[PDB]
Structure 1
């Protein structure tokens, strides 16, 4: 289930992180409004950009930590407040996070692997509820 999915994603995190984030940017092209350096670049070109690989993996690194600390797919309030208060997130609303978790769950449901797609769906909704509670618009 959810806990095994964290271990599976962590066992190949750079490539899962990049392919899920590319799924998100391709599904929601207007979301490049917060990613000006990613515009006018194919999937392969983005993969060759040092900060694309590094930033994307660091994001999924912390995402996996937030999931690991969660209970029944409900993140800690402290993790939610970190995500609201990060200066890198100053621009964001909960909608940005919903769209990311929509792309993550579609990625898992298209995988041949037995991802607990439903647990990840609840996690993204629970995370959006916690982000809202912690003061994200």
Structure 2
């Protein structure tokens, strides 16, 4: 289920982080607007950049923190607030996060593995609604 998926992901976090983030950027080309240093580079090129692996993993580490602190795939309000208030997230709307988890859910379903896709789908929707309650546009 959800808890095991957190362990699966954390076990090889950098690899999953990159795979899922690439699936997201490729599914929603316009989203690269929030990542000017990633434009005009193939998946394999992005992989070779230090800050791509570093940032993507640090994103997914935080995401696993929030996921693990969640109850029934409902994240803590304080975790959503953290995400809203991050200076790096100044420009963002819940739409950015919604698309990320759409991509994440899609990745899981297409994976050979028994991820609990429905739980992650719920977690994503519940994060979005919590982001809104903590003040994100």
Q: Is the TM value for this pair above 0.5?
A: yes
Unaligned segments of structure 2, at least 5 residues: none
CA distance in 2, matches of 1:79, 1:9: 19
Task: Render the CA deviation track for 1:21-76: whole Å, top value 9, x for unaligned.
Answer: 00000000000010000000000000000110000000000000000000000000
Q: How big is the shift at 1:135? A: 0.3
Alignment TM-score, normalising by the size of structure 1:
1.00
- Summarize the alignment of residues 28-107 of structure 1 with structure 2, pairs less than 5 Å apart: 28-107=28-107
Q: What is the CA RMSD across the aligned residues, in angstroms?
A: 0.3
CA distance in 1, matches of 2:2, 2:25: 24
Q: How big is the shift at 1:95? A: 0.2
SS in 2 for 1:67: helix
Unaligned segments of structure 1, at least 5 residues: none
Alignment TM-score, normalising by the size of structure 2:
1.00
SS in 2 for 1:74: coil
List, as ranges, runs of 4+ consecutive aligned residues in structure 1 with deviation greater than 2 Å: none
Task: Render the CA deviation track for 1:83-132: whole Å, top value 9, x for unaligned.
Answer: 00000000000000000000000000001110000000000000000000
Q: How many aligned residue pairs are there?
A: 137
SS in 2 for 1:40: coil
